Design a protein around this ligand. Structure first.
Ligand SMILES: *[C@@H]1O[C@H](CO)[C@@H](O[C@@H]2O[C@H](CO)[C@@H](O[C@@H]3O[C@H](CO[C@H]4O[C@H](CO[C@H]5O[C@H](CO)[C@@H](O)[C@H](O)[C@@H]5O[C@H]5O[C@H](CO)[C@@H](O)[C@H](O)[C@@H]5O)[C@@H](O)[C@H](O[C@H]5O[C@H](CO)[C@@H](O)[C@H](O)[C@@H]5O)[C@@H]4O)[C@@H](O)[C@H](O[C@H]4O[C@H](CO)[C@@H](O)[C@H](O)[C@@H]4O[C@H]4O[C@H](CO)[C@@H](O)[C@H](O)[C@@H]4O[C@H]4O[C@H](CO)[C@@H](O)[C@H](O)[C@@H]4O)[C@@H]3O)[C@H](O)[C@H]2NC(C)=O)[C@H](O)[C@H]1NC(C)=O
Ligand SMILES: *[C@@H]1O[C@H](CO)[C@@H](O[C@@H]2O[C@H](CO)[C@@H](O[C@@H]3O[C@H](CO[C@H]4O[C@H](CO)[C@@H](O)[C@H](O)[C@@H]4O)[C@@H](O)[C@H](O[C@H]4O[C@H](CO)[C@@H](O)[C@H](O)[C@@H]4O)[C@@H]3O)[C@H](O)[C@H]2NC(C)=O)[C@H](O)[C@H]1NC(C)=O
Lengths: 110, 52, 126
């Protein structure tokens, strides 16, 4: 089980906006800016979406966004597409030298 | 006012700054072995770290 | 073009140690951190550890210390995931990914910047 807490699904339709809450505490999220988000299509390898709080890599569209808030940093999608109807997993540094994941956030687009 | 016992061999760290031109001071300049002390007018920032 | 490649789907029996291999294709295998990620079949990702090729130093996650240890050989451009005392709870897909950039100064060992991924293997035990 993940040390980080995060939702498992948020549903809707194209064109909306979302906020998905990955949560930690002082030791992993609070003290550090090392937070990332990874897309996970059904049965596919993961894809990086957001790195270092919010830095979109080439190939990631401005349909995606995120920002830090204390001990919870969240994934903010905008302009939804059914093509992006994937799972989403937050990721963050956790002290010592380790990397931790969280959540099962299946996007749904009717 | 304000003598800091800070010990260094080559560069002088956190010292007081001069008022004017970067004055050279030396006890003698016929005796080349006399250590020559340079006192800057403006500072140069230095940062050191052990990443380990 | 750079790519990460791995051994295909794997078959074993429980208790036996597993030796997943990860090939670094089309880039300097000396210059980037490599990270291992587990994915139980159809489930979320679990983090395993990393390896520094140019240094050879490693660290396995606290959940596996003393049981998982990674090695490499530069002459054949491959990284290895050794995992012994296999429980059937280890039923999962195992991934290989390219991490941050290595530098003499600075420290990117723990950054979650997994850039590309290997196509992975699924281990068959029960
Ligand atoms: C004291 O002083 C010290 C200085 O003496 C100081 O040290 C410095 O510290 C800083 C930390 O702040 C270090 O900064 C990092 O530097 C990294 C190195 O980047 C430089 O070099 C690369 C080399 O590129 C190789 O790879 C390409 C292929 O991609 C090859 O084609 C090239 O030829 C090249 O060579 C390899 O391949 C050859 C093949 O033949 C080989 O022959 C060869 O040997 C090599 O193997 C350059 O690419 C860099 O430029 C690019 O990046 C900048 C910044 O974005 C752009 O402006 C620029 O235009 C280029 O696009 C650069 O020249 C950086 O990579 C690193 O940046 C990443 O990490 C930071 C966090 O550390 C992130 O914030 C940032 O976003 C970057 O993320 C990208 O990269 C990571 C991998 O690291 C990815 O995981 C991530 O997803 C993202 O991906 C990119 O690519 C994606 C596609 O792959 C794309 O989709 C994305 O959108 C994105 O573009 C960081 O800046 C710095 O290196 C130190 N200095 C030294 C000398 O080490 C110290 O801190 C001081 N200390 C104090 C206390 O003051
Ligand atoms: C440099 O090196 C230092 C150590 O020398 C590292 O500091 C350690 O960081 C780890 C981070 O994981 C700390 O361990 C964690 O402790 C949490 C509780 O905090 C303890 O420590 C503080 C500080 O004294 C006390 O206030 C508190 O009461 C505790 O004593 C736990 O919540 C964590 O464990 C939980 O989560 C993990 C998964 O996340 C589970 O596996 C666990 O079972 C448990 O549920 C975790 O154990 C450790 O305490 C730190 N040590 C010190 C001395 O501070 C630095 O991170 C490292 N890197 C850097 C950049 O400094």
């Amino acid at each position: 089980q993940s040390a980080l807490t995060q939702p498992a699904s948020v549903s809707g339709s194209p064109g909306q906006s979302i906020t998905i809450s990955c949560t930690g505490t002082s030791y992993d999220v609070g003290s550090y800016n090392l937070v990332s988000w990874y897309q996970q299509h059904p049965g596919k390898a993961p894809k990086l979406m957001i790195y270092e709080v919010s830095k979109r890599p080439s190939g990631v569209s401005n349909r995606f966004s995120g920002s830090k808030s204390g001990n919870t940093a969240s994934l903010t999608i905008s302009g939804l597409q059914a093509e992006d109807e994937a799972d989403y997993y937050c990721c963050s540094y956790a002290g010592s030298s380790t990397v931790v994941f969280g959540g099962g956030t299946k996007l749904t687009v009717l | 006012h304000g003598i800091r016992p800070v010990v260094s061999t080559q560069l002088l760290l956190n010292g007081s700054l001069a008022e004017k031109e970067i004055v050279i001071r030396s006890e003698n300049l016929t005796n080349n072995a006399k250590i020559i002390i340079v006192h800057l007018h403006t500072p140069v920032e230095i940062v050191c770290t052990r990443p380990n | 073009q750079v790519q990460l490649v791995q051994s295909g789907a794997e078959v074993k029996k429980p208790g036996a140690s597993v030796k997943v291999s990860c090939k670094a294709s089309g880039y300097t295998f000396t210059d980037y951190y490599i990270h291992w990620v587990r994915q139980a079949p159809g489930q979320g990702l679990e983090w395993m550890g990393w390896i520094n090729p140019n240094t050879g130093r490693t660290n396995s996650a606290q959940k596996f210390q003393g049981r998982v240890t990674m090695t490499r050989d530069t002459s054949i451009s491959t990284a290895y995931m050794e995992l012994s005392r296999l429980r059937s709870d280890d039923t999962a897909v195992y991934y290989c990914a390219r991490g941050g950039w290595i530098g003499l100064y600075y420290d990117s060992s723990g950054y979650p910047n997994f850039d590309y991924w290997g196509q992975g293997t699924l281990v068959t035990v029960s």
